[PDB]
Amino acid sequence: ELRVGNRYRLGRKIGSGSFGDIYLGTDIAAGEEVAIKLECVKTKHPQLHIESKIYKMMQGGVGIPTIRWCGAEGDYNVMVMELLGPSLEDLFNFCSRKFSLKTVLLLADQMISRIEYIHSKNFIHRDVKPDNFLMGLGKKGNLVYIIDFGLAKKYRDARTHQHIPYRENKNLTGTARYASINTHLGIEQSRRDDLESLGYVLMYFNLGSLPWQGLQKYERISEKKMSTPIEVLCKGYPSEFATYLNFCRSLRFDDKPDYSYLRQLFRNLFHRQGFSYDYVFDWNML
């Protein structure tokens, strides 16, 4: 009967974050389910309050979850957020690990916008992946949310817009599977890299699997990833997916991406395929 002070009662583990796990909770006074993250106050480097600050800076942004509470309670730092629906990875598995082109396109629009909004707030995410996108609940079930800012970093000063310096010899942050080529080469991550990863995420959804899945280990993925040309990776799928990747890989370190161009590629393709813009995803068809 584990209780976060007076207000919340803890439940089962529902998730795994970059720093610590996510538990199902109840707000007793409200009669309402929530998602709860805990950090031991003794933790060597504490980021829970740091990560909450980012969320609250982002608040009001479309597809950004809302923080109900952040603070210290007993021997824990606590973050409580609004409860959201399943991740895209979860839903991928329920859809036999293949999304229809319509679903991938509907996702890509929203996912590109999420990344664009975070960039507008002077942050890069650095762990763009299917697990870090979640569907909303009820009336927001059609909305893709972005979560987990634990690896997120500020890429430019807010007032001056001074961009962070180019560096090399960096250790990889994020999942190797969706990491950009430059990230595998130890380059400092920037806006291009969030977008490049999103490209691998979309192709993952088209294919069911990437050529560098299921093969020392990090050098082996990097190799296969650098050995596989974009045309090879995207063969049998609309050229837009290769065009997206080639554009992202063209971008220099401090370049601003053209988010409208990339959205438009997929919007035009959507039109040519004749799909209804009805937000009816594959999982709604189940």
Ligand X SMILES: Nc1nc(N)c2nc(-c3cccc(Br)c3)c(N)nc2n1
Catalytic residue at 282? no
CB of 215 to ligand X, least distance (A): 28
Residue whose CB is less far from ligand X, 94 or 218: 94
Q: Which DSSP state fits 177?
A: G
- Using CB under 5 A, pick the residue from 9, 49, 98, 263 that binds Zn ion: 49
Instruction: Give the angle 76-78-81 at the CA atoms, nearest 5°.
Output: 160
Q: What is the chain's alpha carbon radius of gyration, rounded to the nearest angstrom? A: 19
Exactly one of 90, 109, 127, 157 is catalytic; which is it?
127
111 binds Zn ion (CB under 5 A): no
Site membership for ligand X, residue 37 (CB under 6 A): yes
Torsion over CA of 242, 247, 251 and 255, rounded to 10 degrees? -140
The span from the CA of 68 to the CA of 78, in Å, is 11
Q: Can residue 39 be called a binding residue for ligand X (CB under 6 A)?
A: no
Measured CA to CA, the distance from residue 169 to residue 7 in angstroms comes to 46
Residue 46 sits in the site that holds Zn ion (CB under 5 A)? no
Is residue 184 involved in binding Zn ion (CB under 5 A)?
Answer: no
Residue type, 179: A
Q: Which helix (H) or strand (E) holds 123?
A: strand 123-124
Residue 38 lies near Zn ion (rule: CB under 5 A): no
Cα end-to-end distance, the chain, whole Å? 36
Does position 106 interact with ligand X (CB under 6 A)? The reply is no
Spell out the residues 6+ positions from residue 175 whose beta carbon is closer than 8 angstroms to its own: 127, 129
Q: Which stretch binds Zn ion (CB under 5 A): 48-56, 90-98, 200-208, 255-263?
A: 48-56
CB of 77 to Zn ion, least distance (A): 7
Contacting range for Zn ion; rule: CB under 5 A; set: 62-70, 160-168, 178-186, 217-225:
62-70
* Binding residue positions: 14-22, 37
Chain positions contacting ligand X, by CB under 6 A: 14-15, 17, 22, 35, 37, 79, 81, 83-85, 134, 147-148
